């Protein structure tokens, strides 16, 4: 049955509904929301693909080492004469992701941008999480 699902290759509908992923960071949520975490020495960059989501429909909250991205995408409106004969776009409306970052961030200084359906969040690291350099002799 697994090869069949792969043969159907309906990966967006079958996929991108993950409930628990551990990479040393625990991500739990619902719906399609690919996430990329890019950690610098002073901040963390989170890239989230929210295609078809309006900027006003994104609720972005963070605290400590946890980031919550809640968004709702209005489903594709169709006239009565129109009918979806084929569709790969997930129909799920309320999508969300809870991202447990590996470092504490200063949510009071965080900022986020939403361009072309790409949410880029900048989270400055807390002083308690900025690593020092161990001199090698």
Q: Which residues pair with 47 in a beta bridge?
A: 36, 120
Token digits of residue 99:
């991202």
Interface with its own copies, residue 121, by CB under 8 A = yes
As measured in angstroms, the least distance from the Cβ of 78 to its own copies is: 6
Number of residues that bind its own copies (CB under 8 A): 87
Alpha-carbon gap, residue 30 to 8, rounded angstroms: 22
C-alpha torsion angle, residues 91, 11, 5, 28 (rounded to 10) = -80
Interface with its own copies, residue 92, by CB under 8 A = no
> What does R_g of the chain's alpha carbons equal in angstroms?
18
As measured in angstroms, the least distance from the Cβ of 22 to its own copies is: 7
Structure letter (DSSP) for residue 121: E
Interface with its own copies, residue 75, by CB under 8 A = no
Query: Quick one: 15 or 93, whose CB is closer to its own copies?
Result: 15
Interface with its own copies, residue 59, by CB under 8 A = yes
Query: Quick one: 64 or 93, whose CB is closer to its own copies?
Result: 64
């Amino acid at each position: 049955f697994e090869r069949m699902f792969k043969e159907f290759f309906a990966t967006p509908m079958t996929g991108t509904t993950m409930i628990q992923s551990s990479t040393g960071i625990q991500i739990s949520g619902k719906g399609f929301m690919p996430i990329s975490i890019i950690e610098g020495d002073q901040h963390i960059k989170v890239i989230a693909w929210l295609p078809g989501v309006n900027k006003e429909d994104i609720i972005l909250n963070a605290v400590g080492d946890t980031l919550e991205i809640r968004a709702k995408r209005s489903p594709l409106m169709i006239t009565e004469s129109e009918r979806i004969i084929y569709s790969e776009i997930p129909e799920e409306e309320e999508i969300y992701r809870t991202i447990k970052l590996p470092a504490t961030v200063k949510e009071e200084n965080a900022s986020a941008k939403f361009e072309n359906g790409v949410l880029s969040v900048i989270l400055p690291k807390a002083e308690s999480s900025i690593k020092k350099g161990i001199n090698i002799e």
